[PDB]
Amino acid sequence: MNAPPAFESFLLFEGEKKITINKDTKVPNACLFTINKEDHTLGNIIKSQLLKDPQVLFAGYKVPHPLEHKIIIRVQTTPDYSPQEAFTNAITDLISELSLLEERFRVAIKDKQEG
Amino acid sequence: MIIPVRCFTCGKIVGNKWEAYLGLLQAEYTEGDALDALGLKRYCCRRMLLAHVDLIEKLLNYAPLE
Amino acid sequence: PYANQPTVRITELTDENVKFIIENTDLAVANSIRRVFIAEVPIIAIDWVQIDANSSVLHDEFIAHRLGLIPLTSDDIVDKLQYSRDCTCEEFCPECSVEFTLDVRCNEDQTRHVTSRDLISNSPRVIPVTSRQDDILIVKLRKGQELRLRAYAKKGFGKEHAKWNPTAGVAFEYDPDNALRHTVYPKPEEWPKSEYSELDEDESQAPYDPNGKPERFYYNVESCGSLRPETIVLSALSGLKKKLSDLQTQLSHEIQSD
Amino acid sequence: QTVRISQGPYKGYIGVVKDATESTARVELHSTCQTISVDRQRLTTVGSRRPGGM
Amino acid sequence: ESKKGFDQEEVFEKPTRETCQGMRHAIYDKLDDDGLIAPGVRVSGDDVIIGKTVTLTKRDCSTFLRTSETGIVDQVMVTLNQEGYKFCKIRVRSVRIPQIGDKFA
Amino acid sequence: EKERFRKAPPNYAMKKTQLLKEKAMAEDLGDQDKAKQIQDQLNELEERAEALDRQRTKNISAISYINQRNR
Amino acid sequence: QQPMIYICGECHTENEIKSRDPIRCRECGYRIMYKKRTKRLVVFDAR
Amino acid sequence: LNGLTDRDLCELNECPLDPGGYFIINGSEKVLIAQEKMATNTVYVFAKKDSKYAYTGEC
RNA sequence: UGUUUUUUUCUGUCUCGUGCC
Ligand SMILES: [Zn+2]
Ligand SMILES: [Zn+2]
Ligand SMILES: [Zn+2]
């Protein structure tokens, strides 16, 4: 009777923020990015892209509870490199790589048809 | 009771294949060749034509009128 | 501190499935692209059935359940229509939905086979998979029974329900030879060789490789019939790009607000 | 009375108002076996009459 | 229905808001005027399923769907029992989607 | 008055009519009456078989054929 | 003006049955009879 | 339904697969559980120890 | 120089059988 619907996994609720930044107090230059209504699709690629950057000292996400739709990403970089710009660069260059992959796949398909 | 529309595990449409499966078994083909003649490679989709029971016929035997 | 330049090579292009290879990319990107292939792919499907007279032997909900699983071709319609949740009108408008109708009544003595062909759609291009192989059997009617109803179709993705799952099964596989030791075979000689394995029949598995990254990820996206496989790949990549862009915009707004 | 949700995530469902208030109103969904509390303004009466009667 | 006594008597009839003294705080216009719900109609917990009213003016001696059932009426059948009174049976279906905690084996 | 003119076999009372005819034949000790009842029962059975064959000509018969050849 | 249309058991023939009447079909004569589908907005979600 | 073809059974709102052999009382399927007991007309010689008799010839 | 409505927790008996941790 109380099974949740299907739209509460991706659709935002009124008042609920898509992303929230929270600075950590245990170590300097460390913030936990909390993402709402998402899953491993949008966190694993960002985790790996952050891992590629050498200036990022720490990078990793988790799922507080599988039924609940939220992921926390913790990022810790060098003191001369804020984690906000690290996250922004990771997202931007991941977008660029995905677009390039799209373009290459499309040209490969169009060449494969009768060619 | 009736053929499903898609395989539970995979998702390939199998609903449009029960009648063809019966026909191929009808002519001379046997099951082991009929299944791959229809185009079912994964073993998960092959239970839909082997494990399915066709109980809709008995239900249709109880015609409401005439 | 930047990403990579992946390469693509299609090995088999057909109208039912595509086998392509992605090289020079991280495992996480590959797995995410797979999960988007399965879950987050826009596609049209039946999601609102109005049953007016159902005298069949099956349940009233059984008809709707079966109709929900009937694929609908959306090669150039899914990109145009908008999600019903974000619509700015009332009732299922044709600009954001597609109407269907089914009116079959077994009059002759022989039993009827109500197939997907009976779904008379208002739009020409939004039709069940019957263009170019028998049709999806919905139910069987007998003399005296009938089935009248009309349904509307909307856009959705597999994350909401399995009706919007275009891909049948994605065969994701990387590193056919067990070179990275990501799996340890107790008896390698007892296992068969992968389809894409380049090693000879003598050696069982490739030797260990300490400094080696996973590359050359293989794909076998298999379309159910609604969307074309390459169309599925393009739509999934475009959706992932849109999600990334929205996340970037939200992060930028959050940073400026602080 | 039978109503129809015209806006919000449940747009398209059909139900009968169970308990109504000045702002919100509980409507039991036809398909699913669950009752939700949707805003009254999100509802649109459709009714079910029978013209004729002769 | 049955003949309880010389003055007591049961009959199928929609218990209105005026003549019937004993009455539940539930919806009654959901069923037709016979006192039997039509098939394929929404019912939920604590909903009137039959329109039985016994005269004392009348008392709503009608049964209700059990709490936490939330099903749909499949068909309604009416007949006479051996005694010759109006005898009816109603069955309510429910699509139980497999959810967590259900016992499998 | 309705069943007086309305012919009996239609439509779902075929089994009931056959049972009634058999009971009447068993109860009746006469020869002509028993023969007439037996002929009526045989005619009803033949009509029911023909109606089923017409209804079960497709699918219902092909499924029996495939099952028998498969066994 | 609804005369409470009912459906016979085996004959499946429409019958008009009002209150304070025996529950029998217009021909043959049986004791079992069902009701007709409601006229309400029966709308399901194909989920 | 004694030796009746499946045609009539289907026409009488019944199935040929029903095993049968169950009474119908007040519209409820009643079944008689086969009770077992001690065989009659047979001599039994037990050795009950919690009594004053060493042996007992029950029949 | 004027403007029509206030009533609310009901409730059921004794017996037997089956299934589950
Ligand atoms: Zn399968
Ligand atoms: Zn619209
Ligand atoms: Zn009658």
From TrEMBL, chain B:
GO terms for molecular function: DNA binding; DNA-directed RNA polymerase activity; zinc ion binding. GO terms for biological process: transcription by RNA polymerase I; transcription by RNA polymerase II; tRNA transcription by RNA polymerase III. One of its GO terms (cellular component) is RNA polymerase II, core complex. It is found in: Nucleus. InterPro entries: RNA_pol_su_RPB10, RNA_pol_suN_Zn-BS, RPABC5/Rpb10. Its main location: nucleus. It comes from the Eukaryota. Zn(2+) binds at C7, C10, C44, C45. Keywords: DNA-directed RNA polymerase, Metal-binding, Transcription, Zinc. Gene3D superfamilies: Homeodomain-like. Belongs to the archaeal Rpo10/eukaryotic RPB10 RNA polymerase subunit family. DNA-dependent RNA polymerase catalyzes the transcription of DNA into RNA using the four ribonucleoside triphosphates as substrates. Common component of RNA polymerases I, II and III which synthesize ribosomal RNA precursors, mRNA precursors and many functional non-coding RNAs, and a small RNAs, such as 5S rRNA and tRNAs, respectively. This is DNA-directed RNA polymerases I, II, and III subunit RPABC5. It comes from Sus scrofa. The gene is POLR2L.
Automatic annotation (TrEMBL), chain C:
It is found in: Nucleus. Core component of RNA polymerase II (Pol II), a DNA-dependent RNA polymerase which synthesizes mRNA precursors and many functional non-coding RNAs using the four ribonucleoside triphosphates as substrates. Its main location: nucleus. Zn(2+) binds at C87, C89, C93, E95, C96. GO terms for molecular function: DNA binding; DNA-directed RNA polymerase activity; protein dimerization activity. This is DNA-directed RNA polymerase II subunit RPB3. It comes from the Eukaryota. It comes from Sus scrofa. Residues 191-214 are annotated as: Disordered. One of its GO terms (biological process) is DNA-templated transcription. Residues 17-250 form the DNA-directed RNA polymerase RpoA/D/Rpb3-type domain. One of its GO terms (cellular component) is DNA-directed RNA polymerase complex. Belongs to the archaeal Rpo3/eukaryotic RPB3 RNA polymerase subunit family. Keywords: DNA-directed RNA polymerase, Metal-binding, Nucleus, Phosphoprotein, Transcription, Zinc.
TrEMBL record, chain G:
Keywords: DNA-directed RNA polymerase, Metal-binding, Nucleus, Transcription, Zinc, Zinc-finger. GO terms for molecular function: DNA binding; DNA-directed RNA polymerase activity; zinc ion binding. It comes from the Eukaryota. Zn(2+) 3 binds at C25. The keyword Ion transport does not apply. Zn(2+) 5 binds at E27. Zn(2+) 2 binds at C11, C25. It is found in: Nucleus, Nucleolus. Zn(2+) 1 binds at C8, C11, C25, E27, C28. One of its GO terms (cellular component) is RNA polymerase II, core complex. Disulfide bonds join C8-C25, C8-C28, C11-C28, C25-C28. GO terms for biological process: transcription by RNA polymerase II. Its main location: nucleus. Zn(2+) 4 binds at C25, E27. Zn(2+) 6 binds at Y30. DNA-dependent RNA polymerase catalyzes the transcription of DNA into RNA using the four ribonucleoside triphosphates as substrates. Common component of RNA polymerases I, II and III which synthesize ribosomal RNA precursors, mRNA precursors and many functional non-coding RNAs, and a small RNAs, such as 5S rRNA and tRNAs, respectively. Belongs to the archaeal Rpo12/eukaryotic RPC10 RNA polymerase subunit family. This is DNA-directed RNA polymerases I, II, and III subunit RPABC4. The chain holds residues 12 to 58 of 58 of the full protein.
From TrEMBL, chain H:
It is found in: Nucleus. Signal peptide: none annotated. Belongs to the RNA polymerase beta chain family. RNA-dependent RNA polymerase that catalyzes the extension of a non-coding RNA (ncRNA) at the 3'-end using the four ribonucleoside triphosphates as substrates. An internal ncRNA sequence near the 3'-end serves as a template in a single-round Pol II-mediated RNA polymerization reaction. May decrease the stability of ncRNAs that repress Pol II-mediated gene transcription. This is DNA-directed RNA polymerase subunit beta. It comes from Sus scrofa (Pig). The chain holds residues 240 to 298 of 1251 of the full protein.
